C-alpha cells in the first residue's frame, strides 16, 4: 500500500474534546477512543495466504491504568463488529500461544507489558466484509486508574497487524495528580504556627486549612472543592471563617480574580455548634467558570476562642471532584 493507514488513539473528556498532555485526579475514568484503520485496503485484492494471517489489534496501557470497560467496537458503516473479534487479555505476550507471538513478532510489534488484543476470529469473513470494503473499526474502550498510580504520566498506545504486517500508533498521555492538603494553628491569619504549643483560656487560635492546587492543563472542569473541618467544639467556640484565593484564578470569560481575594461571595459556610462539624463549600456554578488553563485554589481561616482547658486537637478533609484527602492533625494544649 502506498499510503499507510496506522492507527490512532485519542483521549476524550465529556464533551468529546481531546485531552491529550492533561491532568486528571485519582478517580478519574480514561474515555478512549481508537482507530483500527483499513480505508486504505479498500479494494485490495489480497492473496489468500496474506488474508489467512488475519487481523489483529493491540491496545497497550502503561502500568497506570487498571480495569478496561469495552463500551463499544463498531465499524465505520455502523456494524457492531464486538462478536467478531476474540478478546485478548495477557500479562505478557510470553502467554501468548506460539502461533499469535510469532505473529506479533514478525510484524515488528513488542509490547512491553500487560496488553489487551482483539483478533479477527475468521479473517476471510472479516476481510470481505470489512478490510476490503475500507471500514475502519473504532474501538471505545474506558479505563479506571490503579489506586496506588499517586503520580507520573498514565499512556495508552495502540497497534495493528493487517496480513502480518505491523504498524504502531500514536501514544496518549495524562498526567495524575493528586490532591494534597495542610492544616496549621495559627496565633492569628499571617501570624506564627503554635502547633504543640500552650493556649491561654480564652484566647483566640486560628486553623488554616491550605487547600489543593488545582492545576493549570488539566482534562476536567471542578465541580466540587470543599473543606469539612471536624472542630472540638468541647474546647473550641467558633467565631468565624475567612476564604481567599491562593492564586490568580482566570475564568473562562477572561475575568482574573487577583491572589489573595476575599472568595466568600462563591462559598457557603455551615457550621453545627452541636457536633463541630464545619464545611465550607465552593458553588458548583463559580467552579464552573474556572478556566482549564487556570490554577486554582483557595485557603481557608477558622478563628476559633478557648473556652476549656485540655489537649485541643484539630484536623479537616478535602474533597476536590469526589476525591477525599485530609491534612495533618494539629494540637494545642491550655
Known amino acids: 500500500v502506498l499510503f499507510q493507514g496506522p492507527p490512532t488513539k485519542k483521549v476524550l473528556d465529556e464533551n468529546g474534546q481531546s485531552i491529550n498532555g492533561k491532568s486528571v485526579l485519582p478517580n478519574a ?42 463500551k463499544s467496537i ?31 513478532k514478525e510484524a515488528g510489534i513488542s509490547p512491553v507489558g500487560e496488553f489487551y488484543m482483539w483478533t479477527a476470529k475468521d479473517p476471510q469473513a472479516f476481510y470481505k466484509a470489512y478490510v476490503q470494503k475500507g471500514l475502519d473499526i473504532t474501538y471505545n474502550l474506558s479505563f479506571k486508574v490503579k489506586k496506588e498510580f499517586t503520580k507520573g504520566q498514565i499512556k ?43 493556649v491561654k483560656l480564652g484566647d483566640e487560635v486560628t486553623y488554616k486549612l491550605e487547600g489543593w492546587v ?18 472540638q467544639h468541647t474546647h473550641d467556640l467558633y467565631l468565624k471563617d475567612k476564604v481567599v484565593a491562593k492564586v490568580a484564578i482566570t475564568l473562562k470569560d477572561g475575568t482574573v480574580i487577583p491572589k489573595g481575594t476575599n472568595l466568600v461571595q462563591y462559598t457557603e459556610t455551615v457550621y453545627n455548634k452541636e457536633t463541630g462539624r464545619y464545611e465550607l463549600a465552593f458553588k458548583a456554578d463559580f467552579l464552573a467558570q474556572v478556566s482549564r488553563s487556570s490554577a486554582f485554589g483557595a485557603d481557608d481561616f477558622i478563628v476559633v476562642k478557648r473556652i476549656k482547658a485540655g489537649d485541643v486537637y484539630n484536623t479537616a478533609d478535602f474533597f476536590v ?14
Not at 492545576?215 to 472542630?231: C, I, M, Q, S, T
Open 156 to 198: 495508552n498506545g495502540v497497534a495493528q497487524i493487517d496480513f502480518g504486517n505491523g504498524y504502531t500508533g500514536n501514544i496518549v498521555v495524562n498526567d495524575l495528580t493528586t490532591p494534597e492538603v495542610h492544616k496549621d494553628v495559627l496565633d492569628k491569619e499571617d501570624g506564627k504556627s503554635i502547633n504543640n504549643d500552650t
Open 29 to 70: 475514568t480514561l474515555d478512549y477512543v481508537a482507530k483500527q484503520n483499513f480505508s486504505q485496503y479498500k479494494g485490495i485484492k489480497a492473496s489468500a495466504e496474506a488474508i489467512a494471517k488475519g487481523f489483529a489489534f493491540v491496545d497497550q496501557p502503561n502500568e497506570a491504568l487498571a480495569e478496561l470497560t469495552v
Open 74 to 104: 463498531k465499524a465505520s458503516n455502523g456494524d457492531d463488529v464486538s462478536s467478531l473479534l476474540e478478546m485478548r487479555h495477557v500479562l505478557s505476550k510470553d502467554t501468548l500461544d506460539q502461533k499469535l507471538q510469532s505473529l506479533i
Open 214 to 231: 488545582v492545576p493549570a492543563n488539566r482534562g476536567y472542569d471542578l465541580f466540587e472543592y470543599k473543606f469539612v473541618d471536624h472542630l
Open 321 to 334: 471532584n469526589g476525591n477525599k484527602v485530609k491534612t495533618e492533625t494539629v494540637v494545642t494544649h491550655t
